């Protein structure tokens, strides 16, 4: 039969079908992971104090949603697929909502729904994209102003790369030297007179804080200066 | 967020080749990466992936692949304005959407501004707006870019969907033949001359990009000549720069030369030995090598009574390797509680004295410092130390020293100041006979909150693990052509604590909510099943939906 789709071995699923297979997909995933998934698709989107109340983090909302809507709309019907199967599978496993099946988790913390092709797309977004390939801290600047109030404006700059060198020839690569990157205006720039590293904190058992600005700075302060880039509020 | 990787070409005994991966996103109750097998419509994947995303970042369809953080500058940031909401670039240019927070016990409005540039961040009143992603407008491309590879039964099929994946992510290949690659995938701008990639530029015009450079300049190796391909968030290529991030560094102190040095130890690898390097990097102290020779030296001098002299003879007949007792609570060797002691007094003495107060907090951390729960994600060398590092290179450091670190005197001479205060500070703790110190192991969490600091479950559920391990979230491994047996490749990985995170209203804890967690303790893994015999034959249970449409 054409409309048909699950074999699982440790509990590992296997999906059979032969075409819109990531129905499967979301099925599966909705039976063993719904409330951790329920709860990525609530901080990539920056709604979790809608059911956690000291969240007002939610303020992630460091991202533009019609740019990733208008993304998903210009999509080949085949591409599309993926995500709307994806949904469509989560949403279907309905049955939670008809046996509450329901994971004890929902009933603790006293709220799913169903699943569109955006939130789908935006749990990758939101972590792959909005968090790991975001990397900037240009809390630079305000560096840079320091050491210049300090050596002045040119040992100051001097020193700045020192701190944060522009490239490094003795760097070990995991290409070999043996090809290499053929490609080989800090003057024109205001002061920064508080870093915005400090306003990002967590404590020790991964949860986040709720302090106040002030003791949120003096926190993730403390806490960097302790473990650094590996620790609690490192990246 | 970070990780290793270690794929095996002239390499591999008994194989053809061997993918041994370690993704590090930290360690979380339910795991991190999700079990799945795609059957059909064009694809014939297993793996495991993180969030279930509809691509798998690390598996197999009978070439494989994986990922780890490339950490390459694909983003700036443009320094816009008292005129509201509108910024020069000859001429006065806001988008702005409004958004309100729902709030469960309490009440809920804020704006968010973008330009041409992208999204503000934040606006200094008293000078400026600063707002740029090389990948704006490619995420979902991305994520079908994930995807589509997993279907590429070549090299050349595969990078032209690498060359689709905007985001800065190493991605690896091996296949069936025993051929191998990387590619240092992303979309990355192409800059103005001047344009340093470390600071903000100006948003007024002649600073805009001039559109994205071409993925023909994207660090690429096929089959190389090492006859392997390690990495672990390392430089992808020789003159290849860094992402911008204060705390990151590419020098000539890194973590990747403890694989390295591994995989040129011998002249090739089993599937076994491959992956006992998992163990090997796992317990593997970072900083020994780095500043052994640097403390070996500076002690030559000193009588074997001098306390000084005395921690650096304990550190010099270390293997360099961390084992946790049984009362799994110590290590059996001090050295780590040492070297913490001693790197956290030189950087207060050269890093942190050269930089202006409150930055010293930046370049204080010695790398090891923990709380109660253990590591949030992987150990690296800390940018204190690769920069101390640099230093104590001196002239054979390519990196011009503007200000002495030293302060005028000798590296010996703060060297040795710092042993004195590592001593004073060890002695106090642990007592002064060296032989019967019993400095406190790492221990490991799998924390019921997911990355963002959110719960992702009851606080209960969270597990321990006595010895914490410098290694990935999960691991997997593929193995191609083994000589021994009937299949063409070989797969297995690690998902703990359980495929499942499901408990009943009633409490009642899934089968498989628990069952990999001391598997990954102990170094251990499950086989991962393609082939329809394979997976029929250890099938636990079936389903068939009828699905209209
Ligand atoms: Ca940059």
Redesign the pocket.
Known sequence: PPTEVIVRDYGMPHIYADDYLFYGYGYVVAQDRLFQMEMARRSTQGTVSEVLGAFVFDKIRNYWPDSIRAQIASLSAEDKSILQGYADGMNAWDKVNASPLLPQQFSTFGFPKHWEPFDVAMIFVGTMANRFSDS?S?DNLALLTALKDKYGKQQGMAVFNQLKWLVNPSAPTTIAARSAYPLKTAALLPRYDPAPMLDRAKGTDGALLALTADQNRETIAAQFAQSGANGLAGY | TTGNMWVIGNKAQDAKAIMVNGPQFGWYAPAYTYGIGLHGAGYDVTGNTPFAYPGLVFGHNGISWGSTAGFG?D???FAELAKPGYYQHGEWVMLSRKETIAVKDGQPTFTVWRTLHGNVIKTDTATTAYAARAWDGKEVASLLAWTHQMKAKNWPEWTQQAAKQALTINWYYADVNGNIGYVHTGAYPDRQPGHD??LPVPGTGKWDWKGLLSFDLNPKVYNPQSGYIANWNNSPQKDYPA??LFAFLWGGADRVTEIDTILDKQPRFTADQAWDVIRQTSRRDLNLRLFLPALKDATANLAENDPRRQLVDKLASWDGENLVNDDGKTYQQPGSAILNAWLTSMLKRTVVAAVPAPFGKWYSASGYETTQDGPTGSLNISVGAKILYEALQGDKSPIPQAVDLFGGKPQQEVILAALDDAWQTLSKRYGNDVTGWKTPAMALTFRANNFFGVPQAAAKEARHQAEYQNRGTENDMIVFSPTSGNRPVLAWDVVAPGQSGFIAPDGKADKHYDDQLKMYESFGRKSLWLTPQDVDEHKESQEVLQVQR
Do not use: F, K, L
Request: proline residues 10%.
């Open positions: 900037t240009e | 500058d983003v700036d940031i990639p470390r992402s911008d």
